[PDB]
Paper text:
This protein adopts a dodecameric structure and contains an allosteric site, making it unique compared to other SSATs. The allosteric site is located between monomers that form the hexamers of the dodecamer, and some evidence has been provided that shows when polyamine binds to these sites, the dodecamer tightens.
R1C1 replaces all residues of this region with the hSSAT1 protein sequence, R1C2 replaces the first half of the residues, R1C3 replaces the first three quarters of the residues, and R1C4 replaces the latter half of the residues of this region. Despite crystallizing in a range of crystallography space groups, six structures adopted the apo-conformation of VcSpeG. Minor differences in residue positions were observed in the overlaid R1C2 (K23-E29) and R3C1 (R149, L150, F151, K152) crystal structures and models. On the other hand, only substituting the first eight residues of this loop (R1C2) caused a minimal (1.7-fold) decrease in activity compared to WT. Based on the kinetic results, it became clear that the region of the allosteric loop that was critical for activity was between residues 31–34 (WFEE). In the WT structure, this portion of the allosteric loop forms several important interactions, including an NH-arene interaction between Q86 and W31, π-π interactions between F32 of Region 1 and F149 of Region 3, an H-bond between the terminal amine of spm and the sidechain of E33 in the allosteric site, and a hydrophobic interaction between E34 and the methylenes of spm in the allosteric site. On the other hand, the R1C2 construct retained these residues and may explain why this construct retained activity. The investigation of alterations to Region 1 of the VcSpeG protein (R1C1-R1C4) showed we could replace residues in the first half of the allosteric loop (R1C2) and retain moderate activity, but exchanging residues in either the second half of the loop (R1C4), the first three quarters of the loop (R1C3) or the entire loop (R1C1) caused the enzyme to be inactive. Since the R1C2 construct still maintained significant activity, it appears retention of acidity in the allosteric site may enable polyamine binding and subsequent catalysis, especially when significant van der Waals and complementary electrostatic interactions between Regions 1 and 3 were maintained.
Residue numbers in the entry:
A (entry chain I), B (entry chain F), I (entry chain J), J (entry chain L), K (entry chain H), L (entry chain G): 5 to 170
C (entry chain A), D (entry chain B), G (entry chain E), H (entry chain K): 3 to 170
E (entry chain D): 3 to 21, 26 to 170
F (entry chain C): 4 to 170
Write the structure that this text describes.
Amino acid sequence: LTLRALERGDLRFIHNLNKELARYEYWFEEPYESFDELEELYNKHIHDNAERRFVVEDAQKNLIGLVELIEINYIHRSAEFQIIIAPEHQGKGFARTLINRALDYSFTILNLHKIYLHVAVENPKAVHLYEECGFVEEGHLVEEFFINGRYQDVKRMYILQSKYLN
Amino acid sequence: LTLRALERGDLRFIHNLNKELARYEYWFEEPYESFDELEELYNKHIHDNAERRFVVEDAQKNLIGLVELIEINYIHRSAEFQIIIAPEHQGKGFARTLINRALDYSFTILNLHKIYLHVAVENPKAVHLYEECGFVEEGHLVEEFFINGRYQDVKRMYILQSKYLN
Amino acid sequence: SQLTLRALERGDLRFIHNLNKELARYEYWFEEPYESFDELEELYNKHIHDNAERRFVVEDAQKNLIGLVELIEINYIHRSAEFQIIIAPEHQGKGFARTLINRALDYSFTILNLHKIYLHVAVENPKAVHLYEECGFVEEGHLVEEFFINGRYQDVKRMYILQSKYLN
Amino acid sequence: SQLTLRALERGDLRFIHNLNKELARYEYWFEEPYESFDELEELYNKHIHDNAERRFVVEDAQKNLIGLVELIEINYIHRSAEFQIIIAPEHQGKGFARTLINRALDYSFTILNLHKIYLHVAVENPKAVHLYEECGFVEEGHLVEEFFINGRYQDVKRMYILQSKYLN
Amino acid sequence: SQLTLRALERGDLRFIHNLARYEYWFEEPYESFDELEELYNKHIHDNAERRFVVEDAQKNLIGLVELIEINYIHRSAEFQIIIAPEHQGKGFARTLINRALDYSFTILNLHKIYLHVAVENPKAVHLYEECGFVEEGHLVEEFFINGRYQDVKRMYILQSKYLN
Amino acid sequence: QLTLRALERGDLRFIHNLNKELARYEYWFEEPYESFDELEELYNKHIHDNAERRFVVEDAQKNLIGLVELIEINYIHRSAEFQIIIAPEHQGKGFARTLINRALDYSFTILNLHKIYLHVAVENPKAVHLYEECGFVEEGHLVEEFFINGRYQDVKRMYILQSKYLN
Amino acid sequence: SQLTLRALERGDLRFIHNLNKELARYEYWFEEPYESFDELEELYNKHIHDNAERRFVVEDAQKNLIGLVELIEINYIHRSAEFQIIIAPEHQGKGFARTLINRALDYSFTILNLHKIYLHVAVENPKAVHLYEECGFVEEGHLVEEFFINGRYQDVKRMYILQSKYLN
Amino acid sequence: SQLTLRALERGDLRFIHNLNKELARYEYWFEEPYESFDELEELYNKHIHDNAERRFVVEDAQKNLIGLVELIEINYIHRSAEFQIIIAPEHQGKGFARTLINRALDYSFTILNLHKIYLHVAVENPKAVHLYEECGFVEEGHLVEEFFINGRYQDVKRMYILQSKYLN
Amino acid sequence: LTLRALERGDLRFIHNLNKELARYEYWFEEPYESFDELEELYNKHIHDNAERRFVVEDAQKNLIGLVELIEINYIHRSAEFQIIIAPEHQGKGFARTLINRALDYSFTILNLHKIYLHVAVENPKAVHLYEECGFVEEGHLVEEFFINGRYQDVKRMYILQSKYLN
Amino acid sequence: LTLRALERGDLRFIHNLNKELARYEYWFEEPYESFDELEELYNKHIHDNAERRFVVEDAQKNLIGLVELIEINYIHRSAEFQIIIAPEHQGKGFARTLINRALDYSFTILNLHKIYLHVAVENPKAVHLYEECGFVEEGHLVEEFFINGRYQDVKRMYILQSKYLN
Amino acid sequence: LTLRALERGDLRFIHNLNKELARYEYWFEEPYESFDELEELYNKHIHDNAERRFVVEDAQKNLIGLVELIEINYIHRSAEFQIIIAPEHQGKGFARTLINRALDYSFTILNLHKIYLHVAVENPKAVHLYEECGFVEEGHLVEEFFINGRYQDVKRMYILQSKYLN
Amino acid sequence: LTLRALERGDLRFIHNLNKELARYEYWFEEPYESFDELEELYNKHIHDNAERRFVVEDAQKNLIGLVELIEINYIHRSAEFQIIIAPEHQGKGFARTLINRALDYSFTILNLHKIYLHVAVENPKAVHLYEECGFVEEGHLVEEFFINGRYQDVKRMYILQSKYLN
């Protein structure tokens, strides 16, 4: 597997990765639900560095998933991490590799200090494998997001540049 | 049935759908009658969340209808629902499922509190259908809209998030 | 029927321009003179959203453009509007005028909810006057030397119809 | 006599705005609705050089503004224009209307070189109709339910005069 | 009762700002006077909403009348009435409502005027009924006001009933 | 058998080429211009202005034959200066008479103008005879009015009224 | 003698306005129509640095404003210009016209280096014609029905003078 | 109380800029860094109608500003927002924080109809944590080395309050 | 050989020609160096008639030279004439024809009275060329221009309209 | 006698002087004739160094005259000098001292290489004065300026920094 | 002494301070030579974060100098420091405190890692001042800058966040 | 090997060259990662000469590497040189020839005075290469950049035209 900076031609894969009416999606903190308004948001934030996205693809160049570093602050050197694996390539053991490739980019190139993420409390397997990757719970945000018709709690888990490098 | 977000390519469809039923059409509360005027109004409000529209295409991949949420207020958490099915694909039992899908999106994704709609009193079949989906009459607006050369009364019917979820 | 009325599009503008080349007339677009196609297209884009005037092109069964229907000087307080209809000489005399007039009135009285529709017809064209009379219009004025047409000040009949008469 | 006609100024806009506070009608400025003084001021500055309409403030020898004289819908191809006169409530009833109407016709036919001046007078006021008839106007139409004034569609008389009749 | 209506002008914006609630201007949220003033200059020519201030003989503003959601095809409009707390209870509400109805039905040529009134304010309901309004709807939990969803009576009056 | 069409931006270059063959200093709505880029900006600036009206003439094959210009238009006095410029390609085939009459017809039957005047070089008597056959009459012999081709040249101002043309 | 020509200033616009209204006629500023002072001031600001037209106020030794001298339609390729003189009635008939005309010709032939100065004068005003003749102007045209003055088309003489004749 | 909470205005910009200078920070305006006042004013003019953040200044009886209350990261789908409060050192410690915090929660839960209001407070400031806890907030996270303040990475307590708890 | 008024499409020619031939580049007396600066200055002074520029193109439309009338005074009817032939088409005798075409346009179209120019005193070939074209020496400006790191004298030579026409 | 930099308050003095000379005035090579035109041109070239003007006042600070440096070219370090003395203080021998002061300022502060000027050939008095001041004739421009109805030749005379310093 | 972010009103100060202390100053690495050009550049680069400037002023509200942090890189966390004190306030012992204030802002607020500076070797007083404030030499650049008409060797000195904070 | 200026068609080659080295790239001091924003920056700085790039191609016009002259300061006659070669054409000895060609273009055509470069301290083979080419160490920048997860030092090596030309 290999990561690559997101291109305009990849936007359609993003729109198909998470189908509408199931997740209220944002692009640089701007709501979007169609491809045409997504394309305009991409053109508007093509140079904005507050959020960086990369598409992962295998040797056959079959797009497998997306990694998003959002809410990037270059003074506190923190960023929220998100990983979205394609349904067809899910369960093949790529989660750990993609997460480690994201942490590698964040701590060895961007020179960030902290990488936090929000994970649904109702997904313990993800929480456990994130802990195995090197994350630690720093918060149990109560009713943070209204998802699928319910206010859900989320575990905020972080990892520091020191741990990953050493 | 497939409920997708509206794209610029679908503008020519809804326009042809609007000319089959004589209506003084509004796009974000702006009158329009030509396709060029519609296209420019679409480009002007492409990022306006005051109204959300979704096209309806069947299994054959043919576009058959439109679902509109308008007058969306995110303080009071209310929205007006409207559904349109082409005459060819009416009477096939799609309206019920599409209404349920719209209510699902409004109450499980947008986290809206109320969904109201106007239905012509002279169309009693639609009134009963909406009643079967959970809507309840809250008003009998007298001579609200001038339709087909006569001021007609319309029943205002609402449904709440509590009843839908519970 | 055989005729369909469709809202005016930018692609149809040049057809409008050609009609005015066949019928020598000092043309206006939203009360602003125009004679070049560029001036027309810039005035079209300027008033794309202005509802003071509404224009519908007429296309036959074979999607051939045959005429224009203009509702100008629309007023939403007095609920009045001046109607005008043009037909290409090729498709003139084929019994379309009456159907298009009825369609225009139908749009004005069942959709826009207007109250009155008036028009001007030259006194020297009594056939048109009779046709409008057959469609329901009635003379309310004989404007003397109102316009300067083809080298002479000509009188015009101001004829009108009301929503009540058309719907009832 | 002693009345003076003067081209409208930006400072006079508050007099114009005050005239229509005691007149219950939907006011227009260059065919554009206005209600507040702000709308009137921005429309004045928008059409400061537009010649489609002309306006003259009428004032006394004491420089007391008494009324207004408008020439709207001016067309320089057909050479027509709609005349309109308003006299302040505190100055109406002194017999100024006739002299001001003649001064309007004089300007229209001796300076602007117009061919026709028409006007609309309500059918429910034959005294004004007669005054216009004395000044040279003659009826050319009885427009039925043209406007909606004070809760009812009222008919109006369209009356005209030509440059030749006034100058000869 | 010699109260006169006047078109809203920029000089009156400050009064409307000082007159908590989630207010709108041509369906655009505003909290600050600068935000309101830019919205006013933006919709200076928009006729989707018409506003008029009512003042007494000595030019003392006492209330505001708003016509919003004006539709010139169906000829309807939502009416909102605000009276300054200093002039409340002096018997002007009836005059303001009837002067608004007179303008709507004698000048604008509208066909229907509807308004929303809190179900927990039956005195306003009775007053509107005296002015000629009739209940056409009992909207349930239409607005979140002061921490609770409140029902509101939608009541209308037609041009015919008022003119005749 | 020719046609007259209102001038459009696509035809601007043709006007520029015409002025390359006729060595003159050209104006557009009374503003000097010598570059096509300056002409195109002036065209877009005065697109809705009606102080001047221009029409290009075409044949059956839609080939450009020339230009007619009504400038210095006055809507109070109902006057306008006429100027016809036919390209050298189609000069001498007898099109001048037709286009002059068509310009007068448009001026007196559509625009409702009172007077149409024009300036013609005294050193070009053939044009004077042409305009005289088309109904024009000399009302002036302006002495050294324009500096043309290295010399101050006299020009005849010749006019025609709406009455004579329509009666 | 005692007469001084000064360059026009914004403060002098009122004088021009009042002066033009005393001789009622359609007023132009840089070939753009105007009637109101507010419109004149905005046109002055627009063409403050435009050299197509140059105007000069006339003042007495007591700085009493007498009249105006206008050089319009100035062409710096053909080196022509149209002259116009407007003296206030309260100072007319005192011989100022001759001196002001000579001063205008001097400025135009000794400072601007113009070639021709032409003018239009009403045929029906013979006194002015002979005045311009005495100043050196010669008739070059009899423009028939050129202008519309006080309800009647009038013929005007076009008279010219050249730089070589004035300087020699 | 005689403490008024007022929506932010242009004139208030130069106060918050000075208040931010007093408490050395890397300030943001709608998630955009700014340092100078001119940059802040351009950002205000840009985000004047942006409802993603809402700011309210505090002024005392003398009508002088003392504090600021910010609602940022306002999500109208999840109905969440980050709360921040700043009080000038000179007026700090006078028991105003609790009143202002309750007024901010009142506006967030009774007008904006929000669900959760959360905030970040430095662990090294236990007095602030206590005050927020007494105002109804409850700890939900202990962010480790989240922010870099005064040359060190400091932990912060993320504490929240729900609409249901506040209203009941 | 045709003389055409300068258009925007020729800006990149004179620019290169001004760098190849080291020239103190001004546009209407406002100095620049960048190409975008040239294009902005052109757009700013497109209607300015204080300076007139004309490119010279052959039959195949290859730009060979530039004719610049600058410091134009419409009261005194004078203007400074500058000719610049590109090195590619230099030594082919075009200089004489272009000088006369420029004199013709100045004296038969613009109705100018005097055309003067400055020529380096250390270039007697150009001096004799202009003398043949009708110009006559009227001044010997001492140390007038700083050329190749050296203050040099320049001859000012003039020609009058009466001489060219008569 | 003292020379002071020109300021707004002095404009009305400049204008007045120009009204006494039948000259076609300029301000940064822009024709003007009215005070309003002069004021707008002054505010347009307030920060332009192409021209520098200094007013001349006596001990009592009465306005005596004006010195103008125009066509200042900082690449060649030249500038044209013009001197105007009010008619009230003419014939008192101030022109000679003011020319010396102007030359001193130009060669000392501005560090200019040449200061040239034009003087009418039919005004030998000014020619003799400038010759006494150090200027030397370098050109006899034929019919350079149209003055008082006739084209007059003008002497262009210069003075170099070296002569004035050494 | 206090530090304040540079604003438009201060532009005429730095301009008069960059001409007094001769320097071909760049505004965000952009050539400028006029006040109006500097003002346009300020409003053009008002939001750019690559460079941060702070004007230092006295308790009497009298400006004394400027402090610039240019070449800011948020990945490597480097920034070049520069400080220019007005001649009138030099020798007062301010430079030391201003250097410490800039280092404080750079290491305690911006969370920068390295701060380097270029200082002329022929100015040993400044070099020793920097050495006293904690800077250390890392490079002896030969003929890097052109000062007083000569190529002068400069010294590149640096300091890190750890030393300053620890 | 021949050196040719950069064209838009070559941008993709540059993008592929950056795939070998996983470091954050800049175009005219603007951060970029994806190809779309690279093309946008290329079109943004198409006319800016502050940085000059030239591509290398062999006899068969097969792309080999890139030569960049960045941080060009025309006032101090300095420039930072950088050379990259595709992995498929390394070890061919092209390094020395391309470095000599670059230095020749810099010291003969651009007439630059100094050429400096930054080379990783942990890559001594490149240091020796540049030493043989003519460069000499003038600085040992401590922790200048953040590479591969660690602050690394870099040698600043220079060469003057006084040494190359002589």
